[PDB]
């Protein structure tokens, strides 16, 4: 039988499902370690690999991308779990190898592929502590092209530091930097913090799909980000004329305020309020 992970309800995606909106005809690129397209609870429409050593984007040796993809769009059926936008068109853009890491050059090619193929939403549950002009250039190009780009703020908050721990490309203003809360809306101890933080989404003990047709729970801002990417798909399936700037402003401005924005951004996303008309 099918379960609904708590994070799906926490952001109020079921309200849109009840309205008949599930992300249909919205193209979502999962820029990550591939997606196990053979998983019975996922429908991957297409993809591309830019990892020289692993040319098949539909095999996920890390499990990272598959877990991310399930939070976005695990199918509504008799098994497994349920994504935020279970009707979204999913695309596997492999830029990380089986270790869950990749080079900025592979990521850039993935982003360019997303632009060239008219993706509506980019999920980047990845990042690093060092910037790259080539990275910022391609990310901005994507956003100027109309793409909603959601990026994990990072998992470097656990040891209090002076200054921002928000990683790249979440640090860039053009991207939505997403931090992690638990089911009580408490910031996760590991969630990066900084002035570049935009919103929070569930990122603790997130049950989602894993390669081999199985399921499991992970922690990280990498798990919160697909909640926001999925929310963007729901919104766009209801408001297909909205710009990526409108979609972002709605997600941020209608978020549930949780306190100091340095740690919480605008707060927890509320896709019901974001998409209300
Ligand atoms: Ca399912």
Work out the number of other CB atoms within 10 angstroms of the CB of residue 216: 12
Does residue 48 sit in helix, strand or coil? strand
Ligand 1 centroid from CA 82, angstroms: 5
**Fold of the CATH domain 1-277:** Rossmann fold (3.40.50)
CA distance 226 to 206: 11
Ligand 1 centroid from CA 48, angstroms: 24
CA distance 101 to 98: 7
Ligand 1 centroid from CA 141, angstroms: 34
Nearest CA among 231, 217, 225, 216 for reference residue 191 = 225
Write down the H helix ranges in the chain.
6-10, 13-18, 64-73, 104-116, 133-144, 221-238, 244-253, 261-264, 271-274
CA angle 102/103/104 to nearest 5° reads 120
CA distance 253 to 168: 23
CA distance 213 to 37: 10
Ligand 1 centroid from CA 86, angstroms: 8
Which residues are placed with Cβ below 5 angstroms of ligand 1, an ion? 2, 41, 74-75, 77, 80
Work out the number of other CB atoms within 10 angstroms of the CB of residue 218: 18
Work out the number of other CB atoms within 10 angstroms of the CB of residue 132: 16
Ligand 1 centroid from CA 186, angstroms: 27
Q: Sign of dihedral through CA atoms 54, 60, 64, 65? A: positive
Ligand 1 centroid from CA 29, angstroms: 20
Does residue 32 sit in helix, strand or coil? strand
- Using CB atoms within 10 Å of the CB of residue 78, give its burial: 0 to 12 exposed, 13 to 18 middle, 19+ buried: exposed
CA angle 20/22/28 to nearest 5° reads 155
CA distance 206 to 257: 22
**Token digits of residue 7:** 């994070």
- Tokens 């100091």 belong to residue: 260
Do residues 137 and 170 touch, judged by C-beta distance below 8 A? no
Helix (H) or strand (E) holding 124: strand 121-124
Ligand 1 centroid from CA 2, angstroms: 5
Q: What is the largest CA-CA distance in the chain?
A: 48
Ligand 1 centroid from CA 182, angstroms: 22
Ligand 1 centroid from CA 42, angstroms: 8
CA distance 220 to 197: 15
Ligand 1 centroid from CA 4, angstroms: 8
Ligand 1 centroid from CA 79, angstroms: 5
Eight-class DSSP state of 167: P
CA distance 277 to 262: 30
Ligand 1 centroid from CA 67, angstroms: 13
Ligand 1 centroid from CA 277, angstroms: 29
Count of helix runs (H) and strand runs (E) in the chain? 9, 9
Ligand 1 centroid from CA 158, angstroms: 33
Ligand 1 centroid from CA 199, angstroms: 26
Ligand 1 centroid from CA 130, angstroms: 37
The reported resolution of this PDB entry, expressed in Å, is 2.0
Ligand 1 centroid from CA 81, angstroms: 4
Ligand 1 centroid from CA 220, angstroms: 22
């Amino acid at each position: 039988a099918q379960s609904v992970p708590y994070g799906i309800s926490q952001i109020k995606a079921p309200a849109l499902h009840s309205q008949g909106y599930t992300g249909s005809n919205v193209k979502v690129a999962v820029i990550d370690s591939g997606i196990d397209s053979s998983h019975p609870d996922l429908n991957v429409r297409g993809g591309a690999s830019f990892v020289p050593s692993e040319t098949n984007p539909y095999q996920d040796g890390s499990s990272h991308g598959t877990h991310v993809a399930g939070t976005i769009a695990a199918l509504n059926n008799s098994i497994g779990v349920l994504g935020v936008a279970p009707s979204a068109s999913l695309y596997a853009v492999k830029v990380l190898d089986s270790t869950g890491s990749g080079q900025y050059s592979w990521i850039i090619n993935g982003i360019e592929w997303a632009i060239s193929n008219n993706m509506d939403v980019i999920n980047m549950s990845l990042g690093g502590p060092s910037g790259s002009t080539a990275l910022k250039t391609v990310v901005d190009k994507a956003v100027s092209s109309g793409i909603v780009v959601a990026a994990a703020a990072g998992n470097e908050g656990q040891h209090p530091k002076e200054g921002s721990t928000v990683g790249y490309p979440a640090k860039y203003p053009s991207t939505i930097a997403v931090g992690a809360v638990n089911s009580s809306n408490q910031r996760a101890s590991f969630s990066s913090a900084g002035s570049e933080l935009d919103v929070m989404a569930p990122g603790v003990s997130i049950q989602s799909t894993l390669p081999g047709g199985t399921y499991g729970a992970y922690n990280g801002t990498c798990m919160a980000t697909p909640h926001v990417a999925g929310a963007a798909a729901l919104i766009l399936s209801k408001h297909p004329t909205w710009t990526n700037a409108q979609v972002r402003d709605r997600l941020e401005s209608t978020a549930t305020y949780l306190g100091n924005s340095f740690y919480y951004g605008k707060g927890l996303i509320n896709v019901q309020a974001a998409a209300q008309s």
